[PDB]
Amino acid sequence: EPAALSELRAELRAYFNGLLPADERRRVGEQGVGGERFREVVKMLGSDGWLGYGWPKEYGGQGRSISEQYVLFDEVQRAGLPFPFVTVNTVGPTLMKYGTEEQKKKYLPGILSGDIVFAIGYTEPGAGTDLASLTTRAVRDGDEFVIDGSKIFTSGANTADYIWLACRTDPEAPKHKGISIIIVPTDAEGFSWSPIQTVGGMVVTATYYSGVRVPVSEVVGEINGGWKLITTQLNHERIGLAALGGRMIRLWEDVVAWARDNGVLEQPWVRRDLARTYAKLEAMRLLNWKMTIAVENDELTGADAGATKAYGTETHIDVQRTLTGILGAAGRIRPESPGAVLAGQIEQLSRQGIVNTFAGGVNEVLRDMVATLGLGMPRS
Amino acid sequence: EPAALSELRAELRAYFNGLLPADERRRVGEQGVGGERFREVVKMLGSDGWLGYGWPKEYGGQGRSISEQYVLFDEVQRAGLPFPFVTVNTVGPTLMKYGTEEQKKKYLPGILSGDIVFAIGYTEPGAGTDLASLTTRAVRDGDEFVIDGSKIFTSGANTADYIWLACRTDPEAPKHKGISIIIVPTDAEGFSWSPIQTVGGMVVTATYYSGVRVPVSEVVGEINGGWKLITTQLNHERIGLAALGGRMIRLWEDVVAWARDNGVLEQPWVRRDLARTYAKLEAMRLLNWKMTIAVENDELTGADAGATKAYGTETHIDVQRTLTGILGAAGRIRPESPGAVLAGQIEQLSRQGIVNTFAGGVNEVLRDMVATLGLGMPRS
Amino acid sequence: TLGEELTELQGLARQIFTDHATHQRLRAVETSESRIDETLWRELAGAGLLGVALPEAAGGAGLGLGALCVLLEEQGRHVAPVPLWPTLVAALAIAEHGTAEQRDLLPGVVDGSRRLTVALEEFGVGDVAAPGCTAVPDGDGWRLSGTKAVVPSITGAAHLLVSATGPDGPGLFLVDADAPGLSWERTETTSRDMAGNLTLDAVPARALGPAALPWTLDVARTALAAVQLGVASGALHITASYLKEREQFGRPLGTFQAVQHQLADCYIEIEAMRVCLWQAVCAAEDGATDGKAALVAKWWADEGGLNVVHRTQHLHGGIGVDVDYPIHRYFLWGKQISGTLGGASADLQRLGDLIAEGAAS
Amino acid sequence: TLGEELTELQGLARQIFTDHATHQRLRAVETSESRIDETLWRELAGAGLLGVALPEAAGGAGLGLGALCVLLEEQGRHVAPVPLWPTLVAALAIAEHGTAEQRDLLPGVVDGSRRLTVALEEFGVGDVAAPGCTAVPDGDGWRLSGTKAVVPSITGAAHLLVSATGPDGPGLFLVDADAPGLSWERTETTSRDMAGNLTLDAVPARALGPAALPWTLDVARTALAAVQLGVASGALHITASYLKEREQFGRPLGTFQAVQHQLADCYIEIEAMRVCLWQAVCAAEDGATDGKAALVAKWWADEGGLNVVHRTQHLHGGIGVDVDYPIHRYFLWGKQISGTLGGASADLQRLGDLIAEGAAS
């Protein structure tokens, strides 16, 4: 049984080795969904059958277990390769739930085959944490919707084929009840994007929708019922943060080995910091495991999801800070500069970890929800 | 110059030694204003001239400097003796500012001589942090006020001669503009108190006012203008927390010496914890010094007072936790039980430090004020 | 199933603790000579809860460290004054590392007539893994000379497990409480337990097996973390209820964002404490001997558990220090537990040495 | 008075930094080869700000470490790309510990034609007080062999102070940047400085006086804390302004209690940083040599300063990672500074050894 996961691990290394080279892995891994070779990788993974590894076989996947799924995510990160998490683990599973039979047929096979990639269109300049205040509008013209607005920080929009777009369809309804999810092709007339470079090395985008026209059948779920879809895909957007923690565990191990071999491990302060981050990483990985079980079971509570995501993302930053200190003078050297340790990964991840305490749910709001949903505290 | 403070230090040890015995000091120090021998000490200190040490000579004091004042407070704590901080450093100086010439003549000399002790009557069951919602009422009858209500956690009320009592005098005014300070004798008919034992070993009280009658001349300041008096005495209520930090610095030093002499100092974790608490104690004592200068100059801002008090009181708890750990198995032994270290002082202070993050201003509200007054952040 | 038995265990303990860990009874017990509720002890024995973690051959249910942790967690939820972890950790040490003669003491533990405690700490540096207390061979027995610090719940214990260093290194030895050369001074601790500072002058003793000491330290760390989990959980529950009731500025304290965030941090820490506790239990039942999982559970207890009870004191304001109100006992228990066998900084140092040593393997 | 001169100093530096540390100019400089703004350097020289901390005999104002810290704090407020602390800490080391020949270099520093840097770090353990770089006697000079890590702002520096261990222990040695046997590899750091990994193969060098190394480390720690104070202050200021503007849920982010509390914790940490900085300065001017005050200032920089710039990233949300928005540079500077000469944990270890040693005196 655990021999099987070991064997899966060893197979996936051979496989990724036959794809990656050297620095290229850490180059496509830094760019993420916005990078040039992203689609090249996705299509390779897809035709080789790895994208549907965890999908139900009803929808063409292998139906493999959570343990096996995590080995896959851990090994793709280790290889440096980008994986289409959002498209395969966030959009597909919400489509399998709320999609028409027609919608599933158009999108799921191409997702599976690595031919269709999605980008998430939620955030606006005026509607970030308060996403339910979004104003991008979609108005009925006949059996078409006419979409006018813009979004910001649309990761992968430059490399995606479709936007999963949250729009205001009923301007008079309660804000949570006026929203629909609409799929917009990135070749649509009136669609455009512009790059945004992040301190962490990623390029995301702003996207613009000027008179974009989409058939009404491209609404996922019910019109004005888009909020339950948004939440469904946001919850599935934690299986990625679990794999992210997996990556920090690996880097912690690599730092232990590095410090062992140059004597940094003989410093009491280093040993103590490795002990404290070990203990916090142990809690994170165990909480992540429980919560993945819940989410794939449709039993995760809002309190637990919020507590686990806020704890895990703050722990990634704590570990990044702490391992950087242990690295000493090399802790400040960027990837690809001489003297970098572990290819500068912890230096670059420190500049990215700051994102995830406010992306995928804002940790302040998650703590509010822990109190109200988890402990019954009154609001207002 | 610093020879003078040294000499002052050595004089005060000889003096307190001629008063204290052994455990008695740590016994009257634990009880505080509510203890039996409190008035006995106060009267001794008063007739020996130490109560007015820092008072202006205009009001019969020595006018000594802040440096000298702090040596005095540090040495009284070191001796175990209780000092009438609230009465001498909080009530007298607000009376010197807002009192009538008549009020000053009745109260200040007996405060100076150690014959008059005051207790602070602010907090009610329904009005703690939201002190401006207090409902204890004082109604005009002629040239008398009739006082009906109760207060809670009135420290020293069992040993005081007068209550500095915050009352609602105008039930129709804005809450901040409906309050007066009234001095109530503790022998007044209708006044009563009952004990409250704290986990830290102190006894405070609830006090009750049933038809208590006081001449209208016993209002300090202007009627309905009591809020500025409350704040004035609350600000002076930081010179005590400065001396409290002084006591934790001394205990930190004693723990260093203790760990040196039994080998606990050879543990890396102990050295690191002593370094971290040293650094936090250094910031505290320097911030306390600046803020004392400001307050005795009438130049302390609300932002700085709040930042310094919240930082200092949380640092006292951090140091208490940390020194307890360094003490090992003896860290858990109460005063007067066998094996206690440093007479169990750090064990008992750990059970008291928890008070001061919400007494004298609630640290959450102080942080609100830091943001609004210090950084201009909007409210509401 | 096993989980169903552990659920039944939990409900039974909850009812018994709820019936006896009351305002009146806690005050009566915490001002007595022993600080031990003998009625609660007998009720626990009669419900089979002392036997649930112990072997069947001694009349127990044979459910091991997991059942013990379920019972200890309920005990901490109610700050219930009985010496369950000293007696039952000692009994599990006997069950797993004792001679036949020593295991014959276990029936009396199951039925409630025989209590134990453990003497694992020393004043000063107090390295629990390298006791300064000495063990000298004497025929097929031993004589122990030294002192042990703050032995918990000493009153009424018939036997003690005492850690000492013999010619072949640290070990664990059984001592009768009436042994010649044994004496103690009663000492009151933060939690209001009545502990004993133990003096041993060539005290007769019998060894447990060679692995008893490190095993017992891992189990004790795990058990203390179970109590702490219950303390923190109960403290959070009481504080949450109180903050719904108490209003200032015209609304429940529970509606202030900073209040909600302090409560959430307690919740997070409790969830972390809980999964690391059960990892330590699972590791012990799966035969791990490296000690890392137990130290992780213990560090979470020492640091997270102590954070929780400081936050729940602060969130109560003045009433939280009133000894007639419940929350201050959770503070006292949490604070004491967070230093038992060493505090958070010591545990990080020990864990860091294990990590370094394992990496250099 | 002296304070009035330091106020004048501060206003002048503020205007110069404000005129040149702009959106456009920061981007131009941080993508250049040197990462150094030579225009800003010349403007600073012309205003006398390079000379303000240096001796009068070299054309400076003779205002010492305090003036240097005032200038560095303004520099950090604007993340202004010039190597002030490497050049001016090196120059203060020469002024206080150099030979007459070495002090003749100071006029060129005052007038802006001569820059310096310091090579105080090494890869790995990198104990700054026990360099692995070696110093061998050679007549009345020395030859140095070893490597130094990430020497800051190496481009255009004419001379370097290099720490090395000779036969009589660690020392500090002046090296010409064109010395035979000296080479470096450019390496880009977190802050976007262009540092150099330095290789020394029997490089000719001249010693500074015997106390130069520990003195220079204390001054450098103090100077780095001055920059960090300015970084954290500027970060907080920008974040406070932004949170007044940005509304969500119908109100400014600045009105949320959790937001106000994160801002307050930054404020508190900055006040703590600031008084410990000035204690370190006052201690150095009063001739203290124990090193504790400088390490306290540096630990506050390393821990408080790093906390501030993490909080100001978080409070901005997505726009805070946009490289076209200012705050991310404060994060990069704060993060790099908090590890320079070692991070927070190392500094606590060093400080703890000094405390232990002083108590055992």
Ligand SMILES: Cc1cc2c(cc1C)N(C[C@H](O)[C@H](O)[C@H](O)COP(=O)(O)OP(=O)(O)OC[C@H]1O[C@@H](n3cnc4c(N)ncnc43)[C@H](O)[C@@H]1O)c1[nH]c(=O)[nH]c(=O)c1N2
């Ligand atoms: C790299 C990267 C990648 C992506 C994204 C961002 C970034 C940086 N996001 C956008 C992300 O979801 C977004 O940044 C968050 O929802 C926050 O919205 P704002 O950035 O407007 O911060 P906003 O201004 O709403 O809040 C900023 C800060 O204010 C505080 N705050 C907010 N509300 C509070 C409250 N109620 N109480 C207390 N404090 C509060 C928090 O400190 C928060 O971090 C995204 N989006 C998308 O649609 N598709 C995508 O693919 C991505 N991917």
Ligand SMILES: Cc1cc2c(cc1C)N(C[C@H](O)[C@H](O)[C@H](O)COP(=O)(O)OP(=O)(O)OC[C@H]1O[C@@H](n3cnc4c(N)ncnc43)[C@H](O)[C@@H]1O)c1[nH]c(=O)[nH]c(=O)c1N2
């Ligand atoms: C030992 C001792 C001694 C004294 C006193 C107390 C004690 C314990 N005090 C009383 C003290 O001033 C009082 O406890 C505080 O003002 C807090 O009021 P409550 O206790 O009602 O807490 P309250 O119920 O108001 O608040 C409880 C907790 O709620 C939180 N909170 C409150 N408002 C908040 C907000 N706006 N935002 C976020 N969180 C918030 C805080 O965590 C606070 O600690 C006193 N009084 C007196 O009149 N004379 C005296 O001599 C003394 N001395």
Ligand SMILES: [Cl-]
């Ligand atoms: Cl994707």
Ligand SMILES: [Cl-]
């Ligand atoms: Cl008083």
Ligand SMILES: [Cl-]
């Ligand atoms: Cl006793």
Ligand SMILES: [Cl-]
């Ligand atoms: Cl380069």
